[PDB]
Amino acid sequence: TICPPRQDYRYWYFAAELTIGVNYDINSTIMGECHMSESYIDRNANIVLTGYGLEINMTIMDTDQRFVAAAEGVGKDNKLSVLLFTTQRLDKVHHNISVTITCMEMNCGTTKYDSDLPESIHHKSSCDITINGSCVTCVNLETDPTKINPHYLHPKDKYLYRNSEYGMRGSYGVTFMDELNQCFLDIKEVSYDICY
Amino acid sequence: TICPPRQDYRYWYFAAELTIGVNYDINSTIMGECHMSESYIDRNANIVLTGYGLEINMTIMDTDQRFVAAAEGVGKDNKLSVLLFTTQRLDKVHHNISVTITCMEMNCGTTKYDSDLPESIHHKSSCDITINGSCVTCVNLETDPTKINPHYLHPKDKYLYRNSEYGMRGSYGVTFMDELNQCFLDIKEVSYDICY
Amino acid sequence: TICPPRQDYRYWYFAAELTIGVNYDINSTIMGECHMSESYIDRNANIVLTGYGLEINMTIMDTDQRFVAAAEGVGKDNKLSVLLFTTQRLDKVHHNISVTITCMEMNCGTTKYDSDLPESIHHKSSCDITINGSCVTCVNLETDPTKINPHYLHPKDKYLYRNSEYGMRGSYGVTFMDELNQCFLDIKEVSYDICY
Amino acid sequence: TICPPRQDYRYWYFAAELTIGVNYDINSTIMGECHMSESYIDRNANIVLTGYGLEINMTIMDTDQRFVAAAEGVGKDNKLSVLLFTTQRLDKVHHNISVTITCMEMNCGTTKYDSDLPESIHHKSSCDITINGSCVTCVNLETDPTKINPHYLHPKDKYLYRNSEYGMRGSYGVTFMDELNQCFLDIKEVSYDICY
Amino acid sequence: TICPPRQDYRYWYFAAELTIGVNYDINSTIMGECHMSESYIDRNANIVLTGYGLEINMTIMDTDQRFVAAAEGVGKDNKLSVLLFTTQRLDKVHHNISVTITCMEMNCGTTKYDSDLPESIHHKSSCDITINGSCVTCVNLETDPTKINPHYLHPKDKYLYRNSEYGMRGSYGVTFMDELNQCFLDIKEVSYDICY
Amino acid sequence: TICPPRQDYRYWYFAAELTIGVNYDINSTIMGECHMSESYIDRNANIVLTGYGLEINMTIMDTDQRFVAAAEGVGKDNKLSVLLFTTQRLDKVHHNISVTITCMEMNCGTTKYDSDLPESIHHKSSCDITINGSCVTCVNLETDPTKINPHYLHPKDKYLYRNSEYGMRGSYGVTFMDELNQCFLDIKEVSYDICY
Amino acid sequence: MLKIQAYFNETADLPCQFANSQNQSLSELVVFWQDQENLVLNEVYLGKEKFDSVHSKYMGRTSFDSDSWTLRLHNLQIKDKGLYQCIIHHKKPTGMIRIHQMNSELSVLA
Amino acid sequence: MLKIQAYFNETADLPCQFANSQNQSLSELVVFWQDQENLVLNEVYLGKEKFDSVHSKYMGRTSFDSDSWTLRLHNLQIKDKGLYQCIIHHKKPTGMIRIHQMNSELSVLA
Amino acid sequence: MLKIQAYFNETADLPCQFANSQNQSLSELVVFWQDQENLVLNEVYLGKEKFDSVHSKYMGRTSFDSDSWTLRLHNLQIKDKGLYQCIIHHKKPTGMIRIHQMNSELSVLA
Amino acid sequence: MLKIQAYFNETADLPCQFANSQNQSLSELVVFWQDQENLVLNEVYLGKEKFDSVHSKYMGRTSFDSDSWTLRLHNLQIKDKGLYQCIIHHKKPTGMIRIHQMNSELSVLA
Amino acid sequence: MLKIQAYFNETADLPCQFANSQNQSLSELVVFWQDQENLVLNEVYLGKEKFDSVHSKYMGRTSFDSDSWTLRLHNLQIKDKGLYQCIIHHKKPTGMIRIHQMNSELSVLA
Amino acid sequence: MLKIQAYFNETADLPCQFANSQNQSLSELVVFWQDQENLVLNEVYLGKEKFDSVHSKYMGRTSFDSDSWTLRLHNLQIKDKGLYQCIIHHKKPTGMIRIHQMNSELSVLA
Numbered sequence A, B, C, D, E, F: 001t002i003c004p005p006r007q008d009y010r011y012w013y014f015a016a017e018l019t020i021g022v023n024y025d026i027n028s029t030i031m032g033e034c035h036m037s038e039s040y041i042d043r044n045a046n047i048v049l050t051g052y053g054l055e056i057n058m059t060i061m062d063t064d065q066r067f068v069a070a071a072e073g074v075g076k077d078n079k080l081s082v083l084l085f086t087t088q089r090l091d092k093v094h095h096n097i098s099v100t101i102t103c104m105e106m107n108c109g110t111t112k113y114d115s116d117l118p119e120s121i122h123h124k125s126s127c128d129i130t131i132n133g134s135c136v137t138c139v140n141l142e143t144d145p146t147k148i149n150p151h152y153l154h155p156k157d158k159y160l161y162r163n164s165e166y167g168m169r170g171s172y173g174v175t176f177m178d179e180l181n182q183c184f185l186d187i188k189e190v191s192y193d194i195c196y
Numbered sequence G, H, I, J, K, L: 001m002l003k004i005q006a007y008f009n010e011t012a013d014l015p016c017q018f019a020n021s022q023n024q025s026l027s028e029l030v031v032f033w034q035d036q037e038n039l040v041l042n043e044v045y046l047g048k049e050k051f052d053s054v055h056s057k058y059m060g061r062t063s064f065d066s067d068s069w070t071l072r073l074h075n076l077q078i079k080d081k082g083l084y085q086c087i088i089h090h091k092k093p094t095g096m097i098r099i100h101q102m103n104s105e106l107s108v109l110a
């Protein structure tokens, strides 16, 4: 229980999802467009994934988890949903999160947002969001999702688990347009190609 | 908005076109004849493309654009049309342009023209044309075209945008023969193979 | 009789089996999941095999045997059976055994068990079991089995032998749940792919 | 006009032909027998082509042309016709020519002819012929031919031009047998494989 | 006559056979199991061939022969027949022989036999046998065989000769079991794959 | 006429043949068995060809010829015929010849014959024959054969010539058996595979 | 975590118990109550009610209270059982950041 | 940028408002007016009218003015609606460089 | 290694002769007897008998003795011949380790 | 470069105007006249006429002149129109080098 | 090397002329005579005759002699022609090594 | 090099003119005359005639001379025309080496 395996690749997964609503146009999934990198050596989990037009850099502080895999998909009205699968959970402490989204195509720019999100669903964790560019309209982050993560349940060999306790789920949200709650839903034309 | 992405390849395009009327003979498109190179490190966008019998070297000063891609085609009466797709437009300031056309086949020679073109359509921009050789009869350059750049709309994955504001278009022209205005039109037997 | 061949690979086999009852989930055999390493230079036989979710490190002290081959399979109720084939038996002395089971996936941890197993079936040999992790519920070890080791009897070219004298078989057991004797039986949906 | 392109390969051609009547036997074209080398760095155009049984070394002095390509064929009565295509003609001055024919197979030897041919058709150009060996009976040279150089008119992609002005053609001739004028004619079983 | 060719491979063969009766189990021929090496630089012909479970090392003293090739086969009751083909015979002197058989699989051990065999068929030659291990029951050696050495008479290109003079044949034998004379006969299910 | 081409490979051939009657057995042609090497740098032509069971080393003194190609064939009663094709003849002087035949398989030995053959057909040329071994019974050598050298007339591209003047033919012969004149004739089951 | 039961065709109440640790005011906040189909039920933009996106079936039946922070839904139905959310947004000049959310599932007499 | 409307079968005027910052003269400039199909309407070469390429239907109906720089087209028709271009070229000894252009779209009574 | 023969419908006794070199007590040990099909026959948990998993046919017919360490099975049948195991486990706080095992094959009149 | 016209069934003259800059003599020169089909017409070998290869139809109708260097062909025909060449060769001991050539096309009444 | 001829239904003798350079004794030697089919004829183990593997057809017809080292076979038949071997083995404590062998071919009247 | 013609059924003579520069004797030489089919005609071994391989049709009709070194063949036939060879060999102790050869073609009346 004390240690994470620190292996090459994992068969056992977990869940944590987010969605970014961008203004420029993306039609559909490309099946191999994403490229992701992961790190844990710092005692803080970090995952940097470059996708369709933006790079997402997520950091969990005091985690005991290392991001095993990820998936990305494009839905209706130019929404990019990213699922992140970590190794396994050992304790319930409501880890903090730091997310930075950089526009690397068609709307590059400097910093436009550096505030922090309270997440008063339980009011124990805070997520610090930094946005570079103007290619963002909605940002939603659900930690410990309770929905059906298994897409095409299931991949050939991987095993997937998901939290079933309501007390652990966390919701962080930031919108710049008018009333964009529930930026999009999971079960749709979203293809969800593996991210790597 | 401030920064251009500075990536490897771009899914996002734009428009700027030109046509060269040469005297020697070109039959049809070869599908792989062109070869182009691009540069921005100078803060001035530059694109040098060698094609059927001439090398074209274009430079935009104070641009905030880098030539993403280009296409070349041959029409009736030995006209070579070149379309140029840049990253994206951030401001409307009517950049200047410098174009140099060198005859590398069948009509080589020294400099024969070094004047500048006023373009008094709005009379705010000036394009300087330098021609080496005798393999040129017409030279037309349309900046910010309003016609249908999307050819075989559209290429497999790329996205193409075009200016729709009449005030930003510019027309530069130079002719040596008698009244060669409108050297040719886009939608024809022009094949337009990607230039690279 | 005095010397073991000390070759590259062997056609002549033997028997010694074990079974590990783990709590996390294993569906079926993967046909190439295991990877094994063997050593004898110390005068003590040692075989370390990394499999589905754990690494097993077994050592025979004063053996005159070098582990030639191995096979691993997954049965019902998440059981992992490992058969080990050694070169050949020269003398009957009831060798001691040291077994270390390390959880390398989904249940890592520190040491949770370091005791020794008496095996009073004849009360002449002792096995020392060290378990790192929480991914173990049953541990059974049959030295010199008398059951039908030949699976798909027999492999293409190998020859297999097994002890037929009841006085040499030894049984070591350790359970953490309630009454888990006979953790599983050989002839089942067990695939038993060769371990290498 | 002043400069030749000095490229790798050319799509534009020209004309100048010659025919060598050799005594030993040649059956038919071999489709890949020739091998040519071209040079201009000296301000004198030089082409050295090794073919069926002899090497031909032709030099034009004060040329402004570089031998782009060549073709060789075998006809009736053991005749070898060589066509040479240059870049393009810039001026009319009736260049001189130096031709050396070396027998590299079946009739090797030392120098047997070093005289010059006046070509009093216009009496402005002089060709110096040096023949090493005994493998020659006729030698005819037509500069700026007016016949149909295009063989299988025309090659896949190349463009071909030919002089249409009578005053520029020149005829050089030398015979060792009796009255071998018009050593052969173009349109025959001559295959005319490209020379390289 | 004085010199042997000392070539790479020989189309010309000869004969000399032996049979080893081993106790452990051999099912059938494997078609590529053997591997043999040859040497003559010492003036003594030496052939060391490793086969199914034993390595045979044979030496002829004052031979004028170098072992060109060999073949191995397995028959009934676990018998291993080895045929050896040498270059050619130059004189009749009844060479001596040294044979060493080492058990490299399933019966390894130290030296168990170091005596010499008289062979009083003509009583002129002596063969010294050294056996390491316990994997041997019969040992027969026929020098200058008179039976039909050609197996599948004949191989694709090789030419085979055999002694037809009774006075030159020699028989060496050693048995540990009871009355094992004529350990087996040539023409049987013996496959006799080429040994290399 | 003075110089030989000194090329890589030649289309133009000539003739000179010989036949060796050996005692050991050769069945038929092997189509690729021969291997030949040639030299002229000494001013004396030399050809060394290793074939079925013997190496033939031929030297022409003061030749002005270099051996271009060769062919070998096996006929009835174990006869090996070798045809040798040289570049071309410039003068008629009846060159001398030195031939050495070495047995490299099945009959090796030291020198057995070192005499010279007068060839009093015209009594102008002498051939020095040296034989190493005992694998020879007949030796015939016809210089400038007047028979039909073209076998399968003719090879794909090579041109073949042969002397038609009776005064130049030379016949050298040496036999060790009884009356073996005309050791064999050309047109037979002789396959005559190219020698290289 | 909040289970509310109502008698057949009874009255429904949806509270979400905003702690309001920052002692903020309704003038700088927006509130949404939405069902499981994403259809809006009510909106209090910076202190004034709005009816810009409510579905017709939800019109009029809603009533908002200031001190109680509870929405009163009337004219229940057999098919109105489901989950409702209390989304609170803070309208900063830069953007709106979600500062509270509460789920509540309601069912009627079966 | 210039929209011209005329009554049914009215007279049509095409100006293009050459600023003429350099105060140039017609003796060194050529002027062309062309429609959306590339057919010429009129040409003023270095001060004199030319009728070398005008289509037959366009012959005679055109008239050019000196001070106004406006072309007066008569006998409008239902099918004559379209875009006209005012292309001005400067005839230097080396080549002609385009120094002014102006679009104008005309439509008739519907 | 222990062959037991019984007359037709005779009584069966299964001992396994636990040496008990450590002089342990029944309060810290568990004993199981099982057949070739893995069905249990009896269980003595820390000194108290338990009947939590014995098959119905095996119920009642078994009786356990303290000093003799022998299980007495009654009402033998033609189909009851087979192998029985004496598995002894030690209940340490961490886990249970098998400290003794004894096989016995029994057959009846045929 | 020399076009000759003759009346119907007129007499034909083929000159080629050898400049003779070196002032050579007919004893060291040969002259050939040939048509477009490569058939010969006449030959003056080192000053003496030869009739070794002239086609039968061409026999007799040709006549050679010394000072004028012109060949006179008589009995013109409708099918005799074509190109004729004046090839002059210099007979050195080593080989013959072409020192002059002239084309001439002749046609008859149509 | 030894050809023996016998008249029709005559007596057969098989000697093999053991030189016995070591002056060894029969108490340490075994002797076998076998035909071309590997069927044994007689065995003298360490001085005593044995009949443990002789084929039935060869029983009784054989007789062994001490001084002559010859086997006497009686009742010859047309089908008994063949080769017989005199294999002598030395029974050392470790193993038996062949010390002498002799072939003899016999044929009868035909 | 030697052509011999004979009248119809005339006598045939085959000489080959051995120079004999070494003044050798018939006792150390062998002579063969063979036709175009490789069949032997006569042999003079070391001075004495031999008839060991002559074909039947060639028997008797031959005759050898000492001083003239000429073979006299009689009874010519229409089908006997062909080429004859005079092969002279030297019988050294090591081997025989050819020291002279001469071809001669003969034809008869046709």
Ligand SMILES: *[C@@H]1O[C@H](CO)[C@@H](O)[C@H](O)[C@H]1NC(C)=O
Binding pocket: A048, A057, A058, A059, A098, A100
């Ligand atoms: C990701 O963010 C962390 C801090 O949140 C930063 O240290 C790191 O450099 C970022 N990754 C990249 C690739 O810039």
Ligand SMILES: *[C@@H]1O[C@H](CO)[C@@H](O)[C@H](O)[C@H]1NC(C)=O
Binding pocket: A153, A154, A155, A156, A157, A158, A159, C027
């Ligand atoms: C493993 O088994 C579970 C249920 O037993 C199933 O849901 C899952 O898809 C399986 N995965 C694989 C890789 O077999």
Ligand SMILES: *[C@@H]1O[C@H](CO)[C@@H](O)[C@H](O)[C@H]1NC(C)=O
Binding pocket: A027, A028, B153, B154, B155, B156, B157, B158, B159
């Ligand atoms: C993307 O979609 C637009 C319209 O939705 C279409 O015009 C374009 O061709 C599409 N491109 C790709 C690569 O799917």
Ligand SMILES: *[C@@H]1O[C@H](CO)[C@@H](O)[C@H](O)[C@H]1NC(C)=O
Binding pocket: C153, C154, C155, C156, C157, C158, C159, E027
């Ligand atoms: C070898 O033979 C035995 C029985 O003779 C058989 O059981 C075994 O499968 C065989 N194995 C191979 C590899 O032939």
Ligand SMILES: *[C@@H]1O[C@H](CO)[C@@H](O)[C@H](O)[C@H]1NC(C)=O
Binding pocket: B027, B028, D153, D154, D155, D156, D157, D158, D159
């Ligand atoms: C180019 O076109 C010309 C005529 O238009 C034609 O003769 C030539 O063959 C063509 N060549 C190629 C390569 O298209």
Ligand SMILES: *[C@@H]1O[C@H](CO)[C@@H](O)[C@H](O)[C@H]1NC(C)=O
Binding pocket: E153, E154, E155, E156, E157, E158, E159, F027
């Ligand atoms: C060679 O010929 C002999 C008999 O002519 C035959 O026995 C042998 O098999 C042949 N071998 C080959 C390789 O042709």
Ligand SMILES: *[C@@H]1O[C@H](CO)[C@@H](O)[C@H](O)[C@H]1NC(C)=O
Binding pocket: F048, F057, F058, F059, F098, F100
């Ligand atoms: C061939 O013979 C020459 C002399 O006749 C000799 O010098 C040369 O070494 C020989 N070649 C080989 C390969 O031995």
Ligand SMILES: *[C@@H]1O[C@H](CO)[C@@H](O)[C@H](O)[C@H]1NC(C)=O
Binding pocket: D027, D028, F153, F154, F155, F156, F157, F158, F159
């Ligand atoms: C060449 O031609 C000759 C006769 O024309 C013929 O005999 C020979 O086989 C030919 N060879 C090739 C390679 O074409």
